[PDB]
Symmetry: C7
Subunit: 79 residues, 7 copies
């Protein structure tokens, strides 16, 4: 079957991803929805700071605007 | 399962709207457009943690173009 | 529903406009537009947080793409 | 509608504020749907005053960078 | 009357001034423009507060119209004062 | 003759991506498309001149509209 | 005489300067171009303000036309002041 960047976004549904917006902020959540424009819907969204033991704020269920995203960590693994 | 009807399901509830400014706002969502244009009843700007209320704007119309994200169920307390 | 119809209901009233640079402007709304191009009267710039006019501009055509939000029902005084 | 309010001020002085917050005045000649303007005798005046900074002559201002345009400057004369 | 792009198109073979989004100004001799306000200038040099300096020569440059604040189409008349 | 068809010659290779943040990231390019969206494996953030990584993000989807330039083969050897 | 984007294609194999919106300048030898001003460069070297002194080597880069301020076509001869 096919493989394209945007399909790989659609395959990350129901798993834990990191989204980095353009302001430099990073939010971890359980990916639930996507679209072509990269509009995300996440569950248990938590802002984090790199370094640090992850969370610094919780936002619950969040609709993210694809226009403002820099990248998406498709399968975020803490090791 | 569209990312947008999740938004329009959140109408009549209290939402958090963050903008590129890092500016966060909280208010009862009334109306919603496909380009994520927003109207909020009782929209008070809140700093992050802080104190919360910073400025009370009443009913605001928010351009969708300038939004980072929207916490659709921001009765997260 | 439709968020921009909420803009045609503020005409001939005072509104507050937050622009992208963060500067705020009060004035009386006259005409509107699809691109949220606004025309205000007695428009005075006020500084972030306060109600103090630091500059008055009179009748002002505002470009819509540079607007953060519009406080539609700025009675709240 | 707004963009015909703009044409009211043809051959009259308007004030234009760009995204970087720099303000410019000059006599409006020509406009279009994206608010691309043409001004004569363009100057930088400094905010609050009408004391020039830089003269620029006839200028074409790209519309997307415009914060606002005060079409009825020159009545701020009063 | 009117069509802002036209005043740009009659400015060919003239000395113009371009203020870009980075906030810097340049002068040069205009040579090619299009509908997207893309500019081709000769003898381009960065520009200042008053008269006009030669801070940095960039020669023959193509200027992407999407990042231009404005263009002064008769700048020679200006620095002829 | 096409700038983008030089990008797809870099798949499975290590490239450097500088976002508009100025922030730069190295990683094995896996997937691309016409919008210059990229998928990197072992995406790590770097500071030019230094050896230590700023952050590890693993397999990353990079949105194409926020990229400055792609070093479509970082031969640092 | 002709059309801006096309004058960019007469600059293939030349040393050109590219300034991005952030303000950083890069020097390299132009390979491939398209309508949206997307570029491919060899010898891509970031140079410091106005000078011709290298600060970072990037080799072959695909540059996004969206983020360009300008392109100094044939930049080679424009190295009078130094080298």
């Amino acid at each position: 079957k096919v493989e394209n960047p945007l399909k790989s976004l659609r395959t990350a549904i129901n798993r834990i991803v990191l989204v980095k917006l353009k302001d430099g902020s990073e939010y971890i959540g359980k990916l639930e929805q996507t679209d072509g424009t990269m509009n995300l819907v996440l569950r248990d969204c938590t802002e984090i700071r790199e370094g640090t033991s992850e969370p610094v704020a919780k936002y619950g269920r969040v609709l993210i605007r694809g226009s403002n995203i820099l990248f998406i960590s498709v399968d975020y693994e803490t090791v």
